[PDB]
Design a binder for these strands. Structure first.
Ligand SMILES: [Zn+2]
Lengths: 48, 287, 161, 99
DNA sequence: CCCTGTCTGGCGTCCTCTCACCTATGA
DNA sequence: TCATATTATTACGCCAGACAGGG
């Protein structure tokens, strides 16, 4: 409902088709947190 | 999808692997039109095209060749959100130690190089000299040096003698700091003493010395050599209702670091005296 | 004997710093304690440092730092700041304010093999010129055309060194 | 303006070349001047045809070098550059000259 | 050398609504 | 218009945490 842009367009198609289901994905503001921590000398990642 | 989040230091090779192009010029945008700067902070080739699947300047106005980069445009050809994930890197002329590892209380470089914070800052702001593997002289490795202490030493130990200053000197010290060797020494020092205060002072130093060896974090990664810049989309430049651009604060910070770095490269490329440049590198360090 | 020293000014006001420095010398009449003053300013290297022939008394040091828009000397310490060399400033002397820039007479048409054509069809193009017909004002610049190296009779003014 | 001097020994070939050049010009740019025929050079040669001696015995050869002057009045960005790609018939020395 | 004043940093409530105001310089 | 680059106020209240001083 809030952040994930591909998640909410999938949600809007699924609501107007009666589906009622969410494809979760990742918050885009967490990627903003990764870019702000990564823009320092810090190397944050996502393992596996 | 993914388990744990791992945090570590950023190597200069790692920062060059994040990057997509060196941000040279500090010039933000044109400001009289709508176009940005080639190649400044808000570049085209280093990051991406403002418009989706369009060369900002002029070629590819349909959906067939997504990627071609002509010489007239010096532009990539992808999505509007592609610039939000892409980051640039500023080649800092003079080495600058991180402030998060120099003033964290306790400082990461304060309890690692066995040197007081006060003395660390003095040398870091071009106000004190530091020795580094002098040689056959009467001086320690951690012991610092002043103008008078260096002048006399300069005329004394003119040969095999090394006494730098700033982040460069600090970097060397960290770089030439056998972690493993210190472990045993510290461990042996803790088992050969009874001093309560010393015990706690030695156990806090050996804890951060063996933890650095357990991971892939290097001692020379504390000093920033390849400063990384945050994506433009994340430092947005939108105008408010009117005809001017309400600019963010990070654009002021990055534009000053790039202005000073260009000045320092020009002073270093003019073969001017070796001292000149202390104020210039100090202003870059503070920037 | 007067030795050289380096002064830092607000970069951009350097000629005005040099003029104000000469005027402070002729105000506080320590004329026997200053020799010269190199302060370049192009329409500029080094556009940020002023070279001063000087001696070191604390009075003359306070004089130079009381000159406006001057930060301070650059040396090992601030007690006894550091001289450098005479050759260092020597280079600047030659081009301190000598007639430089925006002037390319006969040194702007060097043939060799590096030129760009713009006053013609070759829009933003460059090529290598083997032979040249200066007598009849003609150039045989071989611009990469038709997958080869075909030359084209261009005009001296049409091309650009 | 781009003056173009086509030179060749075969006239038909030269003609073909000229047409091609015109075509190349006309699609990209506009107002091609035209294919103007200059005078042909008929460089003649006489030679004695006997190995040893017979002076009235002779062959008179010649090489007919034909000239075609094509001019282009407006050099655009697309047009001038195009020349590189469009390949013409062999044995035709072209000579483009802007201004 | 173990207490000790002294100095330096680091906290300090959530949610909402209305309005105005935004760098100087300059041949 | 298009690069040049940073100075003349004070008036919280704990509460940890680190530091030079001295019996
Ligand atoms: Zn393009």
């Amino acid at each position: 409902k809030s952040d994930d842009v591909n998640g909410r367009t999938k949600m809007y198609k699924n609501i107007v088709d009666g589906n009622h289901q969410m494809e979760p994905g990742m918050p885009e503001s967490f990627n903003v947190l990764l870019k702000e921590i990564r823009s320092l000398g810090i190397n944050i990642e996502l393992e596996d | 999808e993914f388990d744990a989040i791992k945090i570590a230091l950023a190597s200069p090779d790692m920062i060059r692997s994040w990057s997509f192009g060196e941000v040279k010029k500090p010039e933000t945008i044109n400001y009289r039109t709508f176009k940005p700067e080639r190649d400044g902070l808000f570049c085209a080739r280093i990051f991406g095209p403002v418009k989706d699947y369009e060369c900002l300047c002029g070629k590819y106005k349909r959906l067939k060749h997504r990627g071609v980069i002509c010489e007239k445009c010096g532009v990539e050809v992808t999505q509007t959100k592609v610039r939000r994930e892409r980051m640039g890197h500023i080649e800092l002329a003079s080495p600058t130690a991180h402030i998060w590892f120099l003033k964290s209380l306790p400082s990461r470089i304060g309890l690692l190089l066995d040197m007081p914070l006060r003395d660390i800052e003095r040398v870091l702001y071009f106000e004190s000299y530091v020795v580094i593997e002098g040689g056959m002289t009467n001086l320690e490795r951690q012991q610092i040096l002043t103008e008078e202490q260096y002048l006399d030493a300069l005329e004394e130990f003119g040969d095999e003698f090394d006494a730098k200053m700033g982040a460069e000197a600090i970097q060397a010290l960290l770089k030439s700091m056998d972690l493993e060797q210190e472990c045993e020494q510290l461990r042996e020092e803790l088992n050969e003493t009874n001093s309560e205060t010393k015990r706690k002072k030695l156990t806090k130093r050996i804890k951060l010395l063996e933890a650095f060896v357990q991971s892939g974090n290097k001692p020379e990664w504390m000093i920033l050599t390849v400063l990384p810049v945050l994506p433009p989309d994340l430092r947005p430049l939108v105008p408010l209702d009117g005809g001017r651009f309400a600019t963010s604060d990070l654009n002021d910070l990055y534009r000053r670091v790039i202005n000073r770095n260009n000045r320092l490269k020009r002073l270093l490329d003019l073969a001017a005296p070796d001292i000149i440049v202390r104020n210039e590198k100090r202003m870059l360090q503070e920037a | 004997k007067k030795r050289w020293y380096v002064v830092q000014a607000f970069s951009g006001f350097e000629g005005r710093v040099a003029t104000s420095l000469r005027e402070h010398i002729k105000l506080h009449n320590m004329e026997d304690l200053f020799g010269e003053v190199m302060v370049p300013t192009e329409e500029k290297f080094f556009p940020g440092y002023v070279l001063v022939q000087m001696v070191m008394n604390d009075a003359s040091w306070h004089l130079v730092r009381s000159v406006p828009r001057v930060m301070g000397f650059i040396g090992g310490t601030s007690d006894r700041p550091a001289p450098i060399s005479d050759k260092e400033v020597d280079a600047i002397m030659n081009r301190l304010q000598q007639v430089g820039d925006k002037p390319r007479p006969k040194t702007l048409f060097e043939p060799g093999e590096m030129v760009r054509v713009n006053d013609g069809p070759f829009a933003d193009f460059n090529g290598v010129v083997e032979e040249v017909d200066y007598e009849k004002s003609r150039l045989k610049v071989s611009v990469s055309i038709f997958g080869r190296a075909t030359p084209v009779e261009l005009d001296f003014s049409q091309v650009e060194k | 303006r781009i003056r173009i001097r086509l030179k060749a020994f075969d006239h038909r070939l030269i003609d073909q070349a000229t047409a091609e050049i015109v075509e190349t010009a006309k699609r990209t740019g506009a107002q091609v001047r035209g294919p103007i025929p200059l005078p042909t050079r008929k460089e003649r040669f006489t030679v004695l045809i006997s190995p040893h001696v017979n002076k009235d015995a002779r062959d008179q050869y010649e090489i007919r070098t034909h000239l075609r002057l094509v001019d282009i009045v407006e050099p655009t960005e697309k047009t001038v550059d195009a020349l590189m790609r469009l390949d013409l018939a062999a044995g035709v020395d072209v000579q483009i000259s802007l201004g």
